[PDB]
Amino acid sequence: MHHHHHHIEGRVLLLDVTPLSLGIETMGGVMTTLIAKNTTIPTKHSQVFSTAEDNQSAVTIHVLQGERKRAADNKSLGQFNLDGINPAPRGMPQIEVTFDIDADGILHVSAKDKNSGKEQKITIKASSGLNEDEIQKMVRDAEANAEADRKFEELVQTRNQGDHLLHSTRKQVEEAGDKLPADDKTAIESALTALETALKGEDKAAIEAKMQELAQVSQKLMEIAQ
Amino acid sequence: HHHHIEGRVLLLDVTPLSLGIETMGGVMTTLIAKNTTIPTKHSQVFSTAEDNQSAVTIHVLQGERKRAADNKSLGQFNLDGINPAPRGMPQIEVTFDIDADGILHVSAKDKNSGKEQKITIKALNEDEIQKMVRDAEANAEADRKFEELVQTRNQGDHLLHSTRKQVEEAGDKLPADDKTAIESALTALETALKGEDKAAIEAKMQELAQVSQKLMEIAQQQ
Lengths: 226, 222
Prior knowledge:
Oligomer: homodimer
GO molecular function (chain B): ADP binding; ATP binding; ATP hydrolysis activity; ATP-dependent protein folding chaperone; heat shock protein binding; protein folding chaperone; protein-folding chaperone binding; sigma factor antagonist activity
CATH topology of the largest domain in chain A: Substrate Binding Domain Of DNAk, Chain A, domain 1
Subunit structure (chain B): In pull-down experiments interacts with CedA.
Largest interface: A-B, 51 and 52 residues
Number of strands of chain A: 9
Protein name (chain B): Chaperone protein DnaK
Strand order of the largest sheet of chain A: 3-2-5-6
Strand content of chain A: 25-35%
Number of helices of chain A: 4
Subcellular location (chain B): Cytoplasm; Cell inner membrane
C-alpha cells in the first residue's frame, strides 16, 4: 500500500508564502536565487559560495528580491559585509550563506567562513512594501525579458571566465625584471586593453577566442619560467 | 579583488541535476536546483492534498523535467501518524540535505505530531544526465505549459471541493435554481479539470464564482 491518498502540496493554509524570489548578488551582477517565489514560510536554504578574486579578504552579501537575472533589475533589500578571510586563490575559500525565513516572515541572512569560523549575521524583512500590483508587474516584466535574461546569464558566465584570465595573466605579467621578452608585453598590452573593451559589451565566444589567443602568447615565457 | 562573490567554488562538487519531490497534479517541485554546490541544505513546508489524510508519500525526484514520470525516482518513503484534518492544515516540513560526501538526506516532519521520517540515498552517469538535460531542453515549452496547467488544475480543484462543501453546508436554505446553476457549473469545472486547456479551466472557475454569491452568504449564516 504505497502512494494513494498519500499525495502532497505545495499549499498550506496557516502559512505565508514568498511573494517573489530571494537571493544574493554574484559576480557579473547576476542574481543567484536561494529561495524561489511561491515558497512556503518557514523555509531555509544554506549554500556555499566563494571569493571572486585571489587574495580577497572580504565579501559583500547583497540580498536581492525579484525574478530578473540581472541584479540591477531586482529589488535590493539590503547588504552586509564579511571580512577577515585568510587570503587564498579565487574560488578557494568557503563561505556558507544561509537564508532562513521564519513563520513571522523575517529573513535571517548569515554568512560564515568555514575556515576562520567567523560569521556575520543579519535579519531583514522580506514582507515590507510589495502590494501585488507591484509584484505582478515585476514577475510579468521578468516573463517579458526571460530570453534576454538567460542570454545575459550565459554571457556573464563566459565573461567572468574571461575576467579571471585577465586578472591572472596581468598579475603574472612580470615574473622578474625583463624576464618576459620586450615587445611581447606590448602586443599583450594592446590585447588585454582591447579585452577590457571586449567586455563592456554584449557578445560572445568571440571574447572566448580572444582568451584562448591570449593564453598561449606569454605561455612560452611563463611555462619555461616555471 | 574588490568585494564580489563567485558561485563557483572548487574542491566542492556540484549537483548534476535538480532534486525535488512529487507534488499534487503529478508535478515535480524542485528543492535543490541543478548545479548547486555541495554541501547544501534546503527546507520547505508542504501539506496533504486531501481531507482526512493520515499519511504522506515523499517521492524523491531528480531531473529538469516538470512532469514527475519524466524524471528519475531516487526513492520514496511514507510518513504516517498524521492527525486527519482538512487538506492544507497539516504542516509537513521537507528537508533536502546533501553533505560534503555527496550524500542525500531527505526528511519529512509533521509539526503537529512531531513524527519524523528520514531517508539517506547515496552517490547517475554522464550519459543519461546529458540525456536528461537534453530532454529538458527539447520539451521545455511543453513542460512549462504542463506546470501552468497543473497549477490551474490545483486552483480549480480547491475551488471545486470548497464550493461543494459550501453547498453541503446549507442545501436546504439554498434556492433550487441557484443550486442547479451551481451544480451545473461544478460539473462543468470538474469536467474541465480533466482537460489540457488552462483558459477553459479558469473560465469555468470564473463562471462558477459568478453564480456562487448567494451560496457564500447562506453558508456563512449557518
